[PDB]
Symmetry: C3
Subunit: 122 residues, 3 copies
């Protein structure tokens, strides 16, 4: 099962803790509307914790839940948090996606042009 | 054969982080622990965190993670659901000990009442 | 299969919210460099949430992701968060560690002698 999801950010909190500006311990909490071919197919919610920030690369531990009609999909990542694609591990899901594994690649994170490419093994 | 369990839940310690804009909005967070009992005897405890991913006046959505500790092992659950007084169902994603390789669901009823319960179906 | 990783704290944020000092709702966010025999073999990142604090025991829900070349390892714990050794559950991984389970014991946490001892099944 594959899916190309267009991601429209719904709400986002970019929490600046600690030292002003992006640094270890900051965190983003967010929700998105998911679409395919211009039709909404579901939504998601997630949190990213900035575990390591250098000027070239802010590293995040991210947790994401996707809600689709057939069920939910759970993913997690420890990756650079940039526009370059990064791949989250799909650890499971519910409904049609129970006991699923696979990968979710995030492109253009935290921009209007964000997309997910899902590859599920089930 | 699926196993069910009915746990009575008493909130132990709780922090409601009102981050971001004061008042309920995206990015707020609850961190909590509970005492678990059955038939009037403590059987374990839990700890968890909820993140408000989307807040509108009609529906505050939370991503929640929960760990239950029993003598027989741990149980892990997660949800992305409205964070209201209505019952909501979490996915059991795994566990330890007796609950190693567990899957299933956990329904939370009466949240933030004295009669809060978890109803588990483990497969 | 066992594995012992030496752990060097890289960046750490200790968020003291609410009442000063450890109490429910505080959180630590961290990254580490992982090494074996003095050579870096990967890195990790994690977050701990203080779920219950009494004078005797600061309980944390911790999530950890270890990144090695062969794959990632996911662990989580609900345990006391002291200098004493504590054991995390390995819930999964990627690559070589896909479908991994087991336990990860953290000793010497946040000291120069921190180590992870993994038992993967
Ligand atoms: O930090 C962020 C801000 C706003 C939206 C985001 N969406 C994500 C989706 C998958 C993984 C990480 C993400 N991080 C995000
Ligand atoms: O936000 C919360 C505050 C206090 C206690 C809570 N207990 C929960 C148990 C299962 C799932 C979500 C929960 N959220 C909670
Ligand atoms: O609170 C902390 C501060 C600095 C480093 C830490 N490393 C950990 C590794 C596994 C579990 C919990 C941890 N907590 C940590
Ligand atoms: Ca900051
Ligand atoms: Ca707020
Ligand atoms: Ca505090």
């Amino acid at each position: 099962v594959t899916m190309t999801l267009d991601v429209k950010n719904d709400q986002v909190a970019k929490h600046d803790f600690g030292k002003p500006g992006m640094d270890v311990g900051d965190m983003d909490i967010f929700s998105d509307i998911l679409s395919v071919d211009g039709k909404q197919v579901g939504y998601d919610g997630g949190a990213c914790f900035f575990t390591n920030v250098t000027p070239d690369n802010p590293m995040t531990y991210c947790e994401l839940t996707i809600h689709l009609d057939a069920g939910e999909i759970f993913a997690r990542s420890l990756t650079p948090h940039t526009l370059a694609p990064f791949t989250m591990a799909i650890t499971g899901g519910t409904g049609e996606y129970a006991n699923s594994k696979g990968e979710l690649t995030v492109s253009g994170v935290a921009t209007p042009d964000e997309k997910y490419e899902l590859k599920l093994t089930k």
